[PDB]
Design a protein around this ligand. Structure first.
Ligand SMILES: CCCCCCCCCCCCCCCCCC(=O)OC[C@H](COP(=O)([O-])OCC[N+](C)(C)C)OC(=O)CCCCCCCCCCCCCCCCC
Ligand SMILES: CCCCCCCCCCCCCCCCCC(=O)OC[C@H](COP(=O)([O-])OCC[N+](C)(C)C)OC(=O)CCCCCCCCCCCCCCCCC
Ligand SMILES: CCCCCCCCCCCCCCCCCC(=O)OC[C@H](COP(=O)([O-])OCC[N+](C)(C)C)OC(=O)CCCCCCCCCCCCCCCCC
Ligand SMILES: CCCCCCCC
Ligand SMILES: CCCCCCCC
Ligand SMILES: CCCCCCCC
Ligand SMILES: CCCCCCCC
Ligand SMILES: CCCCCCCC
Ligand SMILES: CCCCCCCC
Lengths: 459, 459, 459, 459
């Protein structure tokens, strides 16, 4: 009796419900307001996120130019030493620049002393060489006597004896330089924020693990952010905007939870009526509202993290950015729920609903072939091909090849081996040709055929 | 009675109308003449447009080589100073080259003195440093005391004391060098045109807003064009050609307006007959003729601007070029109006007419997803990914990815973060894979399906 | 009566004709032999073609390294002078290297003296500056007085006063250095060929036509090949192979001409029978045999040219290579004539036969849009975009964009103008987005739909 | 009678057979175990394969930096000498560095003396110049007198007179430097493996075969691996894992062979029953089991090779890697055999089975066109186009072009010839446009149509 009318009303559109019981669509206007405010909050956060990331990266580039002898932009991957004299000069240049920093640097840096290892108390720079405990290497007689246990020896340099360093080249594992520098991110002032205090931990590595006559040289930094002690800025909204976002998301969450509860109660009543199928029950679950509550939770968590970062209780910019960006994407996607009511505007969702199961079953069979190719390429071609170094990189290369991207350069990276390793080159030819042909012309064609057949069904 | 015959005649083809009432198709021959003359005028204008653009750009490159110490082509994005000595040397090199310009430069330049700020009367070069009013920075004690108000102090150099410049490095915001140079674009002589007089305003910036120990250095120019005073060229068509273009476009406009008026009158009579639907009225509007009158207006405006530029009353080359190029494109497109009469030649337009509404409705749903991805990528990945720096650049990157372009390099730009920021790298993996899969395999497939289904309908 | 049987036999396959009248298929075996021999001849010619091209290009690169001060590989497009001292040094370096060539060069070169202009009798090198007859340039007073007539003044240098060169910088149009060198292409010995004598005409240009303060510097060569005088090589097939190719092509031509004549006679008889439609007559014309006779003519012409080049009567390697390569492609394509008899192997040709007319009609409408875009892009974007410099380059860029290639870099080349010329940048955005959308999603889709519909018809 | 039931059981699924006769599916669990263990073995082998390849390549790069004067990374393709003084300096630098190696090198190398040619007994380095027996070259008189027989003259250098080298430049064919160095691959210690002893044979070539004034310089190495004599590593699983892989593959092979024999016997019985068609017999052959036995043979061979390499009996890393990688790919693909039983999961295989014959027939016709284009492009464009140098490279370029990849750069590589060789440039335009249009829009469309029509059939 009334159950039929109740269900019919439960599955009606906002305009239909307004016609029926004069219900005002507050959820829709809330969604529009949410899109606006969440996007604005994301951009406002992005300002400070960019400030932090830029400070870290620019300081690291400046360190590379200051401490690496003969360094130039774009040389990171090939920068290396090849003679004993070059290596000694690089090490001494790094240490001398560390000692001269106050007089030459464009930035203002403070020294850090002591702390844990590798620094002794009062020491600012640690210069450590690591070598085998016993190494006797005699290629002339085709012999060696090695105790592979690593011994670390190093020199402590106080900021304003290291020149007596003697490297044990034949059994040298690596050389490292460790030091910390303190600086202040003044640019924050442009965003009406109090500058933070940064500590950069700088590691310079001269790596000899390959014992190949080529020692690559690299510099890396780790940044630690902390609040400064009683700072002063002459004449030192966002909080209220964050509170507004929180209120909007809370109201949206409450309305969506109420709708889900109403749907659950109606589902229970209908099941009781029928009894007097899991899918027939899930038909009462509004997936869009589950997405909306997930988005609200994400947005509130991101806003709380953002408030904490602004208050200087936290410094996890990356997590906050990921939370807020994902929530913004979900908020933008959420409004399709209201287009679902009209067939002329619901082609994408209607087709995906029919296509997805067969697509998943197809992927079941395609994935094992894809993984076989991934592992084979990674292990066989990785030592020779710059695009096959790692499994994730192999997956990227194969996925791009399926889409027709970067094909000729992939083929050409192997041309160097046609004269050196002919068998590997021939294998790479067969591998690439077979993969491209199979996946572009057979697999992808059938995938698209499944999707277009589903569309033909729903149309 | 006669209304049926009149409407049938009104909807007939040029050949059919010639058969019926012996009407000569002057509009079609006018369209052909218009294509020829408008294209020729565009090319002729392009000659002088190229001359102007080349003068500006070549002078700017020469300035970069003259005034930037150690500059080389292709280094614009990374050119920077890293030590106090480097910065002082760059500043003094720029000023010294400015003073030596008459003796060393291959071009002939005249100095400009006085005028508004930043130059005092009689001064040719302004060397200005901008720093915080009060800056006390103490990273050693984790303290600072800042009044962020910017103070500008600068030295005036008369063209043929600046060597005493002392930079306040710890609170320095930036350094700028401003000067103006006058020159003459002699190359115009090859196009039988009188050379113009150019003033180049040159700004060299040493930017320290990030306070990161790396100060990027850049040079920019702004060009002002003016007529020279009583020039003399020994033995100093285009005007007549412009007048011909104007006459052709005016006649085309008159004929198209007459046709539109006739259609409007016939529409009114038919509506009156029926009365004794907005679409049923718009059926009488020839959209091709609206396009043609728009193209005629654009062409006449562009020709008037071109005449003014040739007379030296205007120098807005870019606006003129845009007007004339758009009008040329529209003129070329306009002749499809006559192919519309024959079905075997009207596949594209006939199919678009049926497909466009459903395509627009589909875009309604796709656009919110696209914008969500744009904002998320711009804010989360922009600090780390060179292709996500700006919203327009993000849109370009995503649009290219949809078309399969530049995929692997997009993936590879993030490989540097796999060791530094693992969470951001993982997010970028999920973001790129999900976007590419969704848009290439689901969205684009259904878009093409809509278009091909419309074609199946009209065929 | 007999006419039906005669026609049925005339349209039968080689196996069917062998069954009917025991006819041996000599044309087919001739085609196979032709493929083999023509391909082999192409490769054999390619050996000597490569030798000639390599000699020219390697000599030109060596000249660039010898005569251009500070030249390095890959700098051709940006190599330029920027100060008077740099230009003087480059000019004097080129002349000094010309004079020192016998002592420093790795190649063996002989000087050429006299001849026509610009060299006087006995002169090996001509150093010429071209300037305006009267040039008074006064940017300070915004005035000039120019007689644009070009005066050429130049110095003659005898191979082993030019140091007194005074350049008129303010009215200088360009500077050129002309000289000729003779050398011998010894590498020909590896191919059992007598070396040729080469004369390289070398032109070095310092171009100041833009009067922009930047003078680009370039070097170009023209090679003239001649037989040497009574050469001697101790112990100094291909001719017989060329004769064999000629005989094979002649026999194929004769058989195809006989077949065409037989078809023409049968066509005339059938028309006479019917009389007691142009297409109904062209149905008797074997297009494959027209292609075969064209290929035979091309092959014979190429072989005669190759024999002449080997005999040293000709040196037009490029024309011979084009003739032989085209003939090889046509010979390879010609064997599809025999697959046309079997439907399971004739899908491509059968479908093209049905699709081509509608494709041509579609192209009629698409071409005007494409040309409008070409002209608009060439004139509006060419001064700003490296990929739009020339009309052919614009066509290449747009054709590649239609196929999804190089999209993001096309967008990115304009990002530099977003700050300098905002209006041009906005126009480029609209231009690229509209072109890509229209052509990839609407035009190409309908093109493929036409082809697949034709296939659906023939299947 | 029983034959029908026997055949029906023979063609049932694992679950169906378990229902029928309670058969435990040991082959399927064996396949899962095989996937796991084979993939793990491949990765474990990849560790040592990477160690070997890295040692070889890093040593070669170090040699290039040590022995090539003025060498820098990325200069391999253009590195060349252009004056006699440069060539002498490069030769003497290489020899001097060879003599100074113990004092300057970061690696530890031992000299090799004597052996076969080109070294005499006691000699470590051979410096050999090769020139024509008689060369008189007179370009001034357009004459030459050559005996092309090559004479080799060379100097022996003992490791710690070559300075008196006099090069016969006008008839010089090339110069080579040969020497061998011994070293130890210590990095193996990180993988708990005993280091191997490497001998690097180093060849430095200064090539003058073109006699063009440009002499390219290159360095190449060949590595020979051997076990060292009585090495000692303080405290010097994989064997047991290899044995486990062998056992698993052997059991899988036995089960698959038993299944194939059972199928053969059933086939014979059915044929005997019918007698009282080759395809009707091949219907009894399980192709998946043939694939599985092939994979088992490959895996066992690869494992035996891996054990031999670990024992130091072999050093063929490339062959072992190819065997194991191919076997891993086949093992991953093999599990689709069990998905073949379910139609919803068998779309790919079911469609391929129907599409493959028509695809092969289509390829018959397409291949001759493709080969014609390959040969034409290789011979005509190869001397001018970097992507057409070799036939394999031409095939890669054309295959990539079909897939839309690298189009604009292919067009742009020819733009340099538009001014030099206009006829070749025009031919390249026609060649590229025709190939791309024909193959992308006609051939590929029909290929995809065949595949999708087969899918339409099986669905
Ligand atoms: C009945 C249905 C059942 C389910 C259907 C079948 C499911 C299909 C599963 C697909 C699996 C494909 C294999 C990918 C993994 C291979 C690469 C890999 O592991 O990377 C190594 C990397 C790490 O390896 P690495 O490179 O760091 O280490 C290599 C080792 N060294 C460094 C020592 C050399 O792992 C990853 O982080 C995973 C990256 C791959 C992820 C790509 C898969 C897609 C992700 C989801 C987005 C798509 C959503 C689409 C939805 C949109 C529309 C709604
Ligand atoms: C019932 C039907 C209703 C309508 C149907 C639905 C309409 C669909 C609307 C599409 C909108 C898609 C979103 C694009 C905007 C995102 C990018 C953006 O805003 O850029 C930022 C830029 C500016 O941002 P920015 O990068 O300068 O600033 C970033 C901020 N900083 C610098 C501080 C880091 O804005 C633009 O200039 C817009 C560029 C995007 C334009 C692309 C859209 C297409 C243009 C029209 C051409 C296509 C015509 C096709 C017709 C051919 C066939 C007839
Ligand atoms: C009824 C059916 C009958 C059969 C149907 C028709 C069969 C179709 C045959 C295709 C042939 C196509 C021509 C390619 C050869 C041209 C290039 C060449 O030879 O290279 C030169 C190279 C060597 O040349 P080079 O470049 O080293 O030498 C040039 C000379 N110098 C150096 C002096 C300048 O040869 C090769 O190594 C071959 C490379 C091409 C291989 C590509 C073909 C595909 C390989 C198989 C993988 C695909 C499997 C797909 C299955 C997946 C799904 C199940
Ligand atoms: C994201 C959940 C969508 C659920 C599909 C049903 C549409 C009402
Ligand atoms: C909704 C998940 C929130 C995760 C926050 C964790 C921050 C360390
Ligand atoms: C550009 C306007 C086209 C209007 C479509 C109707 C064709 C007669
Ligand atoms: C038809 C629009 C003309 C715009 C001209 C404006 C130039 C400043
Ligand atoms: C290349 C000419 C082909 C002619 C088509 C008819 C096929 C017998
Ligand atoms: C790889 C062999 C597959 C054989 C096709 C038949 C499937 C049972």
């Amino acid at each position: 009796e009334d159950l039929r009318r109740r269900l019919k009303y439960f599955f009606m559109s906002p305009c239909d419900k307004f016609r029926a019981k004069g219900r005002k669509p507050c959820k829709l206007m809330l969604q529009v307001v949410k899109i606006l405010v969440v996007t604005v909050q994301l951009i406002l956060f992005g300002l400070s996120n960019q400030l932090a990331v830029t400070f870290r990266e620019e300081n690291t580039i400046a360190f590379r130019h200051l401490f690496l002898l003969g360094y130039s932009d774009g040389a990171d991957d090939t920068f290396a030493a090849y003679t004993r004299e070059q290596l000694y000069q690089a090490i001494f240049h790094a240490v001398d620049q560390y000692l001269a920093l106050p007089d030459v640097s464009l930035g203002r840096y403070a020294y850090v002393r002591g702390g844990g290892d590798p620094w002794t108390n009062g020491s600012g720079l640690a210069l450590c060489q690591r070598y085998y405990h016993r190494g006797h290497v005699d290629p002339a007689n085709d012999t060696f006597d090695i105790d592979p246990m690593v011994v670390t020896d190093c020199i402590q340099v106080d900021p304003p004896s290291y020149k007596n360093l003697t490297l044990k080249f034949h059994k040298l594992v690596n050389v490292t330089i460790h030091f910390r520098l303190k600086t202040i991110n003044l640019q924050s002032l442009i965003n009406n924020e109090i500058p933070d205090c940064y500590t950069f931990s700088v590691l310079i590595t001269f790596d000899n693990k390959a014992h190949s006559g080529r020692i690559p040289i690299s510099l890396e930094t780790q940044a630690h952010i902390q609040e400064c002690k009683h700072p002063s800025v002459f004449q030192h909204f966002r909080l209220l905007f964050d509170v507004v976002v929180i209120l909007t998301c809370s109201l949206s969450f409450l309305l969506c939870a109420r709708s889900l509860l109403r749907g659950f109660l109606l589902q229970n009543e209908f099941v009781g009526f029928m009894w007097r199928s899991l899918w027939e029950r899930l038909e009462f679950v509004n997936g869009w509202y589950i997405l909306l509550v997930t988005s609200d939770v994400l947005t509130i968590s991101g806003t709380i993290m953002k408030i904490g970062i602004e208050a200087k209780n936290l410094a996890s910019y990356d997590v906050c950015s990921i939370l807020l960006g994902t929530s913004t994407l979900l908020v933008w996607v959420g409004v399709i729920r209201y287009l679902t009511f009209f067939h002329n505007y619901n082609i994408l969702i209607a087709t995906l609903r029919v296509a997805l199961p067969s697509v998943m079953r197809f992927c079941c069979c395609v994935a094992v072939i894809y993984l076989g190719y991934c592992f084979c390429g990674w292990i066989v071609l990785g030592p020779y091909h710059v695009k096959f170094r790692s499994l994730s990189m192999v997956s990227e290369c194969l996925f791009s090849l399926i889409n027709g991207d970067d094909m000729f350069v992939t083929f050409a990276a192997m041309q160097a081996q046609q004269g050196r390793s002919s068998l590997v080159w021939l294998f790479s030819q067969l591998y690439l040709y077979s993969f491209i042909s199979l996946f572009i012309y057979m697999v992808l064609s059938l995938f698209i055929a499944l999707i277009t057949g589903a569309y033909d069904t729903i149309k």
